[PDB]
Amino acid sequence: MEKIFQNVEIKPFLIDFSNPFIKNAAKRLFQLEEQLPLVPVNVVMDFKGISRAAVHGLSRVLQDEIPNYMLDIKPGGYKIEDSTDLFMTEQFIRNRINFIPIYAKNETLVFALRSLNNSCEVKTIYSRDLIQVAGPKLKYPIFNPTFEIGFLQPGKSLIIEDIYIKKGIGRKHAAFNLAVKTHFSHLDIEQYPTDKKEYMALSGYKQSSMTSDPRHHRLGLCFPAVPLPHINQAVRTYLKNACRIIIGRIQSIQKIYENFEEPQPELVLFSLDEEKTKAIITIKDETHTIGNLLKTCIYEMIPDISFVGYQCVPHKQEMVLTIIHKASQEDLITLLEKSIQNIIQTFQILEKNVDELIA
Amino acid sequence: TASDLNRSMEQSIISNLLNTISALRTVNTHNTTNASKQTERADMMRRVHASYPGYICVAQSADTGEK
Amino acid sequence: NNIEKYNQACYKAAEARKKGDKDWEKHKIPFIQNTRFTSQMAKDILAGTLTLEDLVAQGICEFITPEEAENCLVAFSIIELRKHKHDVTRRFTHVDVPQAILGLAALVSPYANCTQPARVTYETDMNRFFQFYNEMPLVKTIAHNYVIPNGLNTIVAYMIYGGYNQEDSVIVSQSFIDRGGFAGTFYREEKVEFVPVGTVVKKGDIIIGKSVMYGFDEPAVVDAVGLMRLRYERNLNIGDKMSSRSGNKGIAALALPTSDMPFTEDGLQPDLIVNPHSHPSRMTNGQMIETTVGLANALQGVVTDGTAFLPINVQLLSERLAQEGLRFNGCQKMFNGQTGEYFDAAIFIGPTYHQRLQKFVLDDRYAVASYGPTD
Amino acid sequence: RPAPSIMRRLPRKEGRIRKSLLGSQVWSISRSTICGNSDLHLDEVGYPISFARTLQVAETVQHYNINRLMPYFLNGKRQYPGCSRVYKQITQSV
Amino acid sequence: LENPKISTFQMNVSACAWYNADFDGDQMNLWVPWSVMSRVEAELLCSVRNWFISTKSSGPVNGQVQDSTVGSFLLTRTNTPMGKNVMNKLHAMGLFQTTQTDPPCFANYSPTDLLDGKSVVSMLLKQTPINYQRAPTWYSEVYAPYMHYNKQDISTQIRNGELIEGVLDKKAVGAGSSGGIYHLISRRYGPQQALKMIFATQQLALNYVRNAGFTVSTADMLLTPEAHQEVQEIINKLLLESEEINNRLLHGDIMPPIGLTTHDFYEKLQLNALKFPDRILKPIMNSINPETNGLFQMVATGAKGSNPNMIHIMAGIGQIEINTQRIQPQFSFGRTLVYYPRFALEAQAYGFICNSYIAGLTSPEFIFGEMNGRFDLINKALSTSST
Amino acid sequence: MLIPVVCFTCGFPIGTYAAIFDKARTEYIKTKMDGTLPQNIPLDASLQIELKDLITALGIPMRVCCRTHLITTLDYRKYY
Amino acid sequence: LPNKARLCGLSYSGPVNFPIMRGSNRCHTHHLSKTAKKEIGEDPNEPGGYFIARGGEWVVDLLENIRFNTLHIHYHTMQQGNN
Ligand SMILES: [Mg+2]
Ligand SMILES: [Zn+2]
């Protein structure tokens, strides 16, 4: 009833083989006459009755801050030999291999790249040249075989022996980025025609950003690699996982909140003015996703709040959330605990809505 | 054949592609700097002269070379 | 020109004036000055059939030294020569291509005549940087037919974003740096005066060369053993200096994750965020024109020519943008990547060639602590 | 050119008086490029961690100091904030 | 800065005034006092708070610059293109969330209440009540004929710390603005409070611009075809006046006054003839929209640029003057450049540029402009060396 | 030295289609310039051929940055 | 070969019956081709024109000088004394 996530649309990016030149090149370079094993997927999703903060936080999580997988060379994997090519330095190849999008289920996979050039011409080594030395045999490819790893000058070679699957979040390193933004708009707000030249220098929305409170949004994200046979299932997992990440972070903040009345390094709440009660929460390594989301819920739960705000200073690598309200310390925590529960219910509702639509 | 000359000659010598081209196409007026007299109105010559157009590039160096 | 014919007919017309012909004007003929350069010959030069030596071989061209220049009256461009085609008051000895008054270093900058380098004020493999990725500018000049371009077309947004780009600073995106933007290897070998090749050469270590001490403070790696080559994996670092082709040197002052960068309603986000306050005084209008042209070029998938002194009409370029599907002024609707709110104003964002200057922050930083060598 | 003189050392910008007595090379000093930071107050400067580790501040241990200085001593050179040297009062050695 | 990647000293932009610095590769020296006496001396005597008021001039040294000035104007602006300059409670609170100050109380405002920028600026300024009244840099008699000025913006009045009306501008928050709000704050509460207020106001301005985005486009320097026609007409009128003087010289009707030779009198007369009529601003202002033109707002707020800059960008460069004189013939006996006859009467031959930077100069115009620039650079270098 | 594996600006995997795109672009330019068909057509003329539809056929969306990096990037194999 | 001189730190000076500028007709690289220059160890795109000595590359810049056989009538006097 009243699904927050109302409409979805999955549209993979496909190669149009009707074009003669693309078809001729693909059939010649890679003997390819059909869609690749993995394809980008553009998912356009419409949300209703949810704050902009929550939708944008989900978008941020999907872009990065969601655990993802990448191919990395273990130290000493790059074998320096006499025949090793000078141009194909370890840094260059490491970057190329790192930023190959992969869709791996098992982390215990190791690949190796043993390429030797004996022809007089320059040989190009493609991602198909990667072979699975260790780990369970792959029933389906985890990356497309068309990437250009590099090229070897005649008589040279390149050997890499330990290419394992690393895990991380895109925020710390770009190689772990998961989603590419493609669209974001508020269907709630009307728009001027921006071709008129009287509104050409404006955003196009008829409401100022400083007063508008959109509640109906359309969000579009593109996922680099997804198995073609199972596009729908992959989108379910990605969308579901982000909700889990947000819920976990909010629940950690909730743990800190409930643990008040006991010394907590993060929570620092002290009564000022004998009626107001400040409450400063410092979380290391937290981002705008939770700070912005936490500010919105409290504001919605406490319309008459004296003040609420946050500051994720880039050079402090921490998130500080400040709350001031006219109430006792105990009453303030209960309101904040209730506000946190509202997000968790919202995202729990959001998670189930995914199973209803994407199927 | 005398080899002692090479030392003095290389001492005298010591005395991306845009950089390489600019360095070689550069025309250093070192004799004039020696006559600058501790930069006593020496800059007056860095000005663009009416004879330059077509022969000496009229656009400023833009710190690409010496200060 | 045909002045000898012009003069001869001039005498005949005057004589008819003394006579009773009254048709003296019929004898007068219009003056004509025109170069022998032909559109066909221009095509041949690009095809390579016709060379300058052949041009000089015929009476089309000749070399003029600064001495002989004093005997020459030159039309600054073919436009001027045509404008005064029939004018006998001003007879030209030669006509020149206006691009000839610039060198390659200056010709690199596109739409240079639309900027004044005057306000651009600048007065007062060892150590060589190899950059992996280089791309041709979207708006290329003639200079790029003789030099390999260095730098990258970086989507740059001209906006105020948190105040970290003030005073010629720049806000780079951390993801752009990670992906390999402006990334390369810095090479430095001991040369005259071992250790295994590929060994981490930490500060205060012993590297026997044919020079054991190593105090650069930045970890290195033994590239080779003219020997003992050290290589540094140098990325783009906060404090590194980038500059557009039209001067505009700037220092990378902040790096942000892809989630914090601003994005357009179409998902486009910038690599660099240049402060709009750099333009007004410095007047690098060529940078703006390059951005405007590059938007359309990228959308159409073409690379156009922006050589200086070529005819330019900014109105027509903006109309081209409007035709392509964007706004007439080239601005888009942008959202704050941190809060997800849209800016009340459209933001001018588009590609703009950038390169990194070879002055690295890690090279000139230094700190010492209360002890060391003394005189 | 080969004229080493006692009196030639005094004059000129590179002479004794102008280079050594008036002006001096000093220890415990750092140099680096500057950048903007909107989150720093007017009277604050952002200092890199490595430089904060290279440069030191000398504190004399005392009864009021000991508790605050103990964490620095324990951290040593392993974790910031830490320390680099200690000067014993009894032994007159660092 | 505990992030291992950062390897540069970082300071607030407003601090660059003390050191005369710019983030263009400039380096600076830093040393930490390690002796108790030196630390006490540094903290009590050499704190930058003391250098807020210049010893040389006794006026302020620090203030808002560039984005901070523009953002102050935008925040205090009475009307925006969307409508009245108002914000809801959420965004009013969000303005103060990085000022590093005790946030003001919003308990009396409903989520639907609308607050104007003057209101939030006043909320911030109640910490240091000052009285201030002055006309902003926004209001200029140069622009009044060709644009509409809101009554609430033409006059700035801060009464007991409350911004009653007007727009904060370079005249009020700019660096080195004698009698500015920071000057009075320092004079009444101390230099330390002035720096804190500068930081807080800068944060307010930047936070506002965070939503009311600001940009400069190429289309901001484009003249309407009618304005282009007006500019061409003005240039043609100037050229006609120059040609009339040229005819006077041809007939010998030039009679120099006592003390000036015919050549000097002719040069002065031509120089006076070739000057923009000050009506050249009309076509520029007609084409641009003051409310949404980034370049014009930057120039008018005093954040960066000047009126001659806009005139050169849009209308035309005009006459090049070196040492208050035209391009003296130096290529040859009578010539000024290889592109002109020996004794040329046209103004184009002596350093008159009829084009505009946006329109694109021709080769000789470009050469003259570079002559002027090299002259300026040479003068600066020689001045410093002599000083 | 090669078209980047992913767009520097988005991270979109333009490197999947880089080799196919290069071959197809070479063939497309050759087909258009067959009117003359020398060994090497002038670069200035060659780069004026529109590649919007060719890129669209591959699947890359209409993203300014992705197409910019796809068409502009220099290939170290050609220059050598 | 020029790279051997660079790589080994040896001067490229020629026998004196004198450093040889690379790309000169006196150097071995004269009339060489891009494929060969790569094989020898040189960058094919380098135009030469610089001396190899002391292990580091050195390039001599063009120097301008007053014209010869020309009477340069300098009106400049002597600042020390108006003699
Ligand atoms: Mg500077
Ligand atoms: Zn992209």
Swiss-Prot record, chain A:
Induction: Expressed in the early phase of the viral replicative cycle. The keyword Transcription applies. It comes from the Viruses. GO terms for molecular function: protein dimerization activity. Keywords: DNA-directed RNA polymerase, Early protein, Host cytoplasm, Transcription, Viral transcription, Virion. One of its GO terms (cellular component) is virion component. It is found in: Host cytoplasm; Virion. One of its GO terms (biological process) is DNA-templated transcription. The keyword Transcription applies. In the N-terminal section; belongs to the archaeal RpoD/eukaryotic RPB3 RNA polymerase subunit family. In the C-terminal section; belongs to the archaeal RpoL/eukaryotic RPB11/RPC19 RNA polymerase subunit family. Component of the DNA-directed RNA polymerase (RNAP) that catalyzes the transcription in the cytoplasm of viral DNA into RNA using the four ribonucleoside triphosphates as substrates. This is DNA-directed RNA polymerase RPB3-11 homolog. The lineage of its organism: Viruses, Varidnaviria, Bamfordvirae, Nucleocytoviricota, Pokkesviricetes.
From Swiss-Prot, chain D:
It is found in: Virion. Induction: Expressed in the late phase of the viral replicative cycle. Lacks the typical C-terminal domain (CTD). Belongs to the RNA polymerase beta' chain family. Catalytic component of the DNA-directed RNA polymerase (RNAP) that catalyzes the transcription in the cytoplasm of viral DNA into RNA using the four ribonucleoside triphosphates as substrates. Forms the polymerase active center together with RPB2. Part of the core element with the central large cleft, the clamp element that moves to open and close the cleft and the jaws that are thought to grab the incoming DNA template. Part of the viral DNA-directed RNA polymerase that consists of 8 polII-like subunits (RPB1, RPB2, RPB3, RPB5, RPB6, RPB7, RPB9, RPB10), a capping enzyme and a termination factor. This is DNA-directed RNA polymerase RPB1 homolog. It comes from African swine fever virus (strain Badajoz 1971 Vero-adapted) (Ba71V).
From Swiss-Prot, chain F:
Component of the DNA-directed RNA polymerase (RNAP) that catalyzes the transcription in the cytoplasm of viral DNA into RNA using the four ribonucleoside triphosphates as substrates. It is found in: Host cytoplasm. Gene3D superfamilies: Homeodomain-like. It comes from the Viruses. Belongs to the archaeal RpoN/eukaryotic RPB10 RNA polymerase subunit family. InterPro entries: RNA_pol_su_RPB10, RNA_pol_suN_Zn-BS, RPABC5/Rpb10. Signal peptide: none annotated. This is DNA-directed RNA polymerase RPB10 homolog. It comes from African swine fever virus (strain Badajoz 1971 Vero-adapted) (Ba71V). Part of the viral DNA-directed RNA polymerase that consists of 8 polII-like subunits (RPB1, RPB2, RPB3, RPB5, RPB6, RPB7, RPB9, RPB10), a capping enzyme and a termination factor. Its main location: host cell. GO terms for cellular component: DNA-directed RNA polymerase complex; host cell cytoplasm. One of its GO terms (biological process) is DNA-templated transcription. Keywords: DNA-directed RNA polymerase, Host cytoplasm, Metal-binding, Transcription, Viral transcription, Zinc. GO terms for molecular function: DNA binding; DNA-directed RNA polymerase activity; zinc ion binding. Zn(2+) binds at residues 7, 10, 65-66.
UniProtKB/Swiss-Prot annotation, chain G:
Catalytic component of the DNA-directed RNA polymerase (RNAP) that catalyzes the transcription in the cytoplasm of viral DNA into RNA using the four ribonucleoside triphosphates as substrates. Forms the polymerase active center together with RPB1. Part of the core element with the central large cleft, the clamp element that moves to open and close the cleft and the jaws that are thought to grab the incoming DNA template. This is DNA-directed RNA polymerase RPB2 homolog. Belongs to the RNA polymerase beta chain family. It comes from the Viruses. Disulfide bonds: none annotated. The chain holds residues 113 to 225 of 1242 of the full protein. Induction: Expressed in the late phase of the viral replicative cycle. The binding of ribonucleoside triphosphate to the RNA polymerase transcribing complex probably involves a two-step mechanism. The initial binding seems to occur at the entry (E) site and involves a magnesium ion coordinated by three conserved aspartate residues of the two largest RNA Pol subunits. It comes from African swine fever virus (strain Badajoz 1971 Vero-adapted) (Ba71V). Part of the viral DNA-directed RNA polymerase that consists of 8 polII-like subunits (RPB1, RPB2, RPB3, RPB5, RPB6, RPB7, RPB9, RPB10), a capping enzyme and a termination factor. Coiled coil: none annotated. It is found in: Host cytoplasm; Virion.
